[PDB]
Amino acid sequence: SGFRKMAFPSGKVEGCMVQVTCGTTTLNGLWLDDVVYCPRHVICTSEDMLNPNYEDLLIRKSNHNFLVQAGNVQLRVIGHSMQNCVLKLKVDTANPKTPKYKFVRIQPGQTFSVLACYNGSPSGVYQCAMRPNFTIKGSFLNGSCGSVGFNIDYDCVSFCYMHHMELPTGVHAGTDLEGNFYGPFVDRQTAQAAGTDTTITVNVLAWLYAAVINGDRWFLNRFTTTLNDFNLVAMKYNYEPLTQDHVDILGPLSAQTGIAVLDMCASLKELLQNGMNGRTILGSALLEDEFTPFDVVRQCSGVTF
Amino acid sequence: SGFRKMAFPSGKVEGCMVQVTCGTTTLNGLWLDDVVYCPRHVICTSEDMLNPNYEDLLIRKSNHNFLVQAGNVQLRVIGHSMQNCVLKLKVDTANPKTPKYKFVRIQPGQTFSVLACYNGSPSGVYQCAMRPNFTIKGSFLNGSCGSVGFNIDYDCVSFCYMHHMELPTGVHAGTDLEGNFYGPFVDRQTAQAAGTDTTITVNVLAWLYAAVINGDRWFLNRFTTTLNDFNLVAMKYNYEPLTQDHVDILGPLSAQTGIAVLDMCASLKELLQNGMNGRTILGSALLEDEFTPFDVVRQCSGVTF
């Protein structure tokens, strides 16, 4: 019993975190095989960030301008190139701790673990969701750039996020490991803002199934709804539309609890229209949307890595 | 910016998790140097658990009755002893991945990371607090016994908890790494229940200071309180008494924000009376009590917004 915001074990990623320094800027890098990946803004001064020409700034740097420190060992940079908003530093040593890995680009609503790092040293691990507005509500301070997000699918680390920036509302923006930003953000110190966010409906439903599995049933009711009527309600409350794919994905949880997906939708509709009336669900007074259906099944079945 | 329930990176502990089997019972063990620590109830069947005589059950076991598996390698047990509710299995191989570590017994209110494991394989990491009633609200399924709780301030792992059991309310009980239970619990299937739990007041105050550091002040008021009047009110909401030690511990956060501890106590008193009136504090509609003053200082910026 119990249901916690749980991150994947971070050990496989901790063994890849390094410190990258270019001039006065120090941030984190991800060392996989003989390449260290880091935000390309490591080459910029604060003034360069106002309007950077990354190709021009990079051509002025040599391999020795990049200092890469892995623990108490200085790695030798033997090559450098840029791929979108990521800088790839070829080093003369393959990381002996490189796990089985892939680079995957995730969709909004998908969750991942973040290993927050400073000076190439992991400081903490937490679970995030890619918001529908493509930001993450992370917890990052200055020096955290280059920290990565990941999932583990069997014994393979799927890296999905690299941290680049904090927006004025305190939320975060980053790229996949191919350097493509999530969201309409640019790696420039210019006016940028998170768009209006919405709630990840399929995740709220998954979490309501987790609450039922854990014995919290007060919100269940005799009613059902159609997908069309439920989506009218979802639109009204700034909830993401629920698709037939989401309904299909919730099938296993629906079968385990005996509550049809549209029956759980009728509970959610009632919660949106009336609130919780002083009650909580899994210790929360808000509807939680940062657990996917897969996270719920995984946590309630004890999948190991 | 941001404020998340953050766990320590789990890698140093993942490299210590092993599977311990005695007969038909299998659970997790913690392999540090040449010793594997695990709950002594690994020697019990379900029938033995009503009134087990552990000395009598253990004297009937030899070293080769304990099977310890570390990855795909079977370790050889060369000695065994019981210390309180923990079984210590001496093995013929020192764990090459043994981090710098210590065993620390914590007090209620302290937080720690839990690396939930099954069959010696880590499944997830989450943050917990030792409740005032000496239970933890974990997320554990059958097979999770032997999973451990820890903190990693600096490069030293301080192991503070080993999981033994789940109480009827779905909360969890365990021991320190010397096998002494937290609370009045015993490793026996006898009628046991968690006592009435209370809110960890010093942690709620620490979290309100985190909210102020992160730029929110809506909940502050023009009032102060005496420590005794604060306690008289807080106890009516099932909050733990706030002691002068707690006031002293909140000194650094009080100095950074410029809000006196008793001034923050008055804000907490008002929040208990009014609720949040549709507002949230650090993304929560409830007062959070699983961040200590130390956790807030570690996670938050040293500069108030």
Ligand SMILES: O=C(Nc1cncc2ccccc12)[C@@H]1CCNc2ccc(Cl)cc21
């Ligand atoms: O956002 C950035 N870094 C940070 C990242 N995360 C949390 C931070 C907290 C506090 C201060 C900085 C933080 C940097 C510096 C500001 N200008 C800027 C512009 C574009 C890009 Cl790609 C990066 C940046």
Ligand SMILES: O=C(Nc1cncc2ccccc12)[C@@H]1CCNc2ccc(Cl)cc21
């Ligand atoms: O509590 C125990 N195990 C578990 C531990 N954690 C989460 C569980 C979830 C679901 C089922 C079991 C779980 C065991 C078995 C039950 N009786 C018992 C009595 C005393 C002792 Cl020390 C251990 C136990």
Ligand SMILES: [Cl-]
């Ligand atoms: Cl303590």
